[PDB]
Design a protein around this ligand. Structure first.
Ligand SMILES: NC(=[NH2+])c1ccc([C@H]2[C@H]3C(=O)N(Cc4ccc(F)cc4)C(=O)[C@H]3[C@@H]3CCCN32)cc1
Ligand SMILES: [Ca+2]
Ligand code: NA
Lengths: 5, 250, 27
């Protein structure tokens, strides 16, 4: 998963 | 979703991804029913046999998504949970009877082209649509096979199955709060929900008013897309009094 | 009041690729 804010 | 296909952009705007904070992972599917309430399966939040007991701070709700792994900037909305409500008579000990839970969001989510609520059925909706042979639609970012993961949201249409057939396919006790769906071996077509898709919606489009209604919640199955097995779903209308009670009170 | 009507489909009278399969099953 791409990192979230 | 096994044997399904890529969803179209905005095809299921009520689709919600339940995302675990640490480690970061897909926990389950869910659905948007108002700007502040999200519906899912109780087993996504509470399942003692596997030491699963999530609290509000353990996860996030991601709405408006299409890509499974990407952070969809300017499109998805990430929401925190204020409170989780699990059906008080959810039977996790035996057969997942009453597999339903609600989550209230900390703040209302703004609707958009990619974020919009699904309707919940009333008694007439259920009587009209919950018939053997009538097809519903299941969506999710879960496994593509029982034994990888999709790049984007998957969709599959599946027929509701006669209750005797559902009953005869398993040793588990089926209740009135469940229905099953899927193709039979002799039908040729395939498809089922799988790990990662549970808690997600089984929806149907009313041919009377052209609106989508969430008739079920992905609840359980034995394996995924196995011949002679069917996916089981929580019967949303049968549990609607509980849904209304929770929303009316909180 | 607007539940179940998708902005990119029902709201603009566009149909998705497989919704007709559902309609055909509602005999
Ligand atoms: N093939 C399907 N349609 C399908 C649908 C849902 C699931 C679910 C739940 C699921 O099936 N189970 C196992 C189960 C089955 C019957 C019971 F009476 C009790 C428990 C779970 O614990 C849930 C789990 C959580 C990860 C995915 N898997 C598995 C397969
Ligand atoms: Ca049986
Ligand atoms: Na099957």
């Amino acid at each position: 998963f791409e990192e979230i804010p | 979703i096994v044997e399904g296909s890529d969803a179209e952009i905005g095809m299921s705007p009520w689709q919600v991804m339940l995302f675990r904070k640490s480690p970061q992972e897909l926990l389950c599917g869910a659905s948007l029913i108002s700007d502040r309430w999200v519906l899912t399966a109780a087993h996504c939040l509470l399942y003692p046999p596997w030491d699963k007991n999530f609290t509000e701070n353990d996860l996030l709700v991601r709405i408006g998504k299409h890509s499974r792994t990407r952070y969809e900037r300017n499109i998805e909305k990430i929401s925190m949970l204020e409170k989780i409500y699990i059906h008080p008579r959810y039977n996790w000990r035996e057969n997942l009877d009453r597999d339903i839970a609600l989550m209230k969001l900390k703040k209302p989510v703004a609707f958009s082209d990619y974020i919009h609520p699904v309707c919940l059925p009333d008694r007439e909706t259920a009587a009209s649509l919950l018939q053997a042979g009538y097809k519903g639609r299941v969506t999710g970012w879960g496994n593509l096979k029982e034994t990888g993961q999709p790049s984007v949201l998957q969709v599959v249409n599946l027929p509701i199955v006669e209750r005797p057939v559902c009953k005869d396919s398993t040793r588990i006790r089926i209740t009135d709060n469940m229905f099953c769906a899927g193709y039979k071996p002799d039908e040729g077509k395939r498809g089922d929900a799988c790990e990662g898709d549970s808690g997600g919606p089984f929806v149907m489009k009313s041919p009377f008013n052209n609106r989508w209604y969430q008739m079920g919640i992905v609840s359980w199955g034995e394996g995924c897309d196995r011949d002679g097995k069917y996916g089981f779903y929580t019967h949303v209308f049968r549990l609607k009094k509980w849904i209304q009670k929770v929303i009316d009170q909180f | 009041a607007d539940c179940g009507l998708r902005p990119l489909f029902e709201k603009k009278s566009l149909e998705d690729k497989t919704e007709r399969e559902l309609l055909e099953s509602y005999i």
